[PDB]
């Protein structure tokens, strides 16, 4: 966790600072080609199985039609690339798409319990006093069904 | 045609001979690595003594 990444994840974004911090975080990328997930696969460098999970899946039809939330997805993508975790979790952790550093305390707790007791990723999420997820993904049964 | 048949048969038995040479070479190299690792075992026994 570099300090610059901590400034990216720390800051709060209204509609006022929106295009300013957009141009700060993207330069001159237009929101239209940023909206389509193929340039997301090209830029953010993911698998398309991984790209099933970001906004949603996407055929050439319009699906999970956003207006704009490009900064909120940027924080969670960069965080997941840092801490190496799937996206049911970072949906599940603070579903209000916001970051306060006690969320970073939580994620240090779960990463430390994983290393300490050598358990699964759902299992230390139980230890963060969070409920059992029933949502299924990755063509696999959920925490509940397993 | 019989002359050409004898020529190609002689070339083929040369190739099979060369393949047997290569199998013998690989067995020799494997035994050599085996004996080096057994030397490491023996010097460990020497330290124990």
């Amino acid at each position: 966790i570099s300090p610059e990444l901590f400034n990216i994840l720390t800051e709060e974004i209204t509609e006022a600072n929106a295009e300013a911090i957009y141009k700060q975080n993207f330069g001159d990328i237009d929101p239209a080609c940023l909206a389509m997930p193929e340039y997301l696969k090209s830029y953010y460098n993911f698998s398309d199985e991984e790209l099933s999970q970001f906004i949603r899946k996407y055929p050439d039809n319009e699906l999970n039609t956003q207006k704009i939330h490009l900064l909120k997805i940027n924080k969670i993508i960069l965080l997941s690339q840092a801490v190496n975790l799937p996206f049911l979790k970072l949906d599940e952790i603070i579903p209000e798409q916001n970051i306060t550093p006690t969320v970073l305390g939580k994620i240090f707790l779960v990463k430390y319990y994983m290393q300490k007791y050598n358990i699964g990723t759902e299992t230390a999420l139980i230890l963060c006093n969070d409920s059992i997820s029933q949502y299924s993904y990755s063509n696999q049964p959920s925490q509940f069904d397993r | 045609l019989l002359i050409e048949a004898e020529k190609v048969s002689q070339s083929e038995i040369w190739r099979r001979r060369r393949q047997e040479w290569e199998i013998q070479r690989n067995n020799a190299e494997a035994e050599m690595k085996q004996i080096d690792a057994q030397l490491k075992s023996l010097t460990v026994r020497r330290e124990a003594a």
Binding site: - | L1, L2, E4, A5, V8, S9, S11, E12, R15, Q19, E22, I23, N26, N27, A30, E31, K33, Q34, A37, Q38, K40, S41, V44, R45, A48
Partner: protein, 49 residues
């Protein structure tokens, strides 16, 4: 205990050598005849014809 680890290494070496022999003989077995050997059988039957 260090000695017994060195013995595991010498069995790794012998295992690798036997594995190389097995794969090489399996290759020369399943590739049963060459191209030129079948050409020799072709030249003989051409002479018969």
């Amino acid at each position: 205990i260090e000695e017994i680890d060195a013995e595991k290494t010498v069995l790794e070496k012998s295992k690798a050598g036997a594995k190389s022999r097995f794969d090489n003989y399996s290759k020369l077995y399943d590739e049963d005849v060459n191209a030129g050997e079948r050409q020799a059988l072709d030249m003989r039957i051409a002479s018969q014809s």
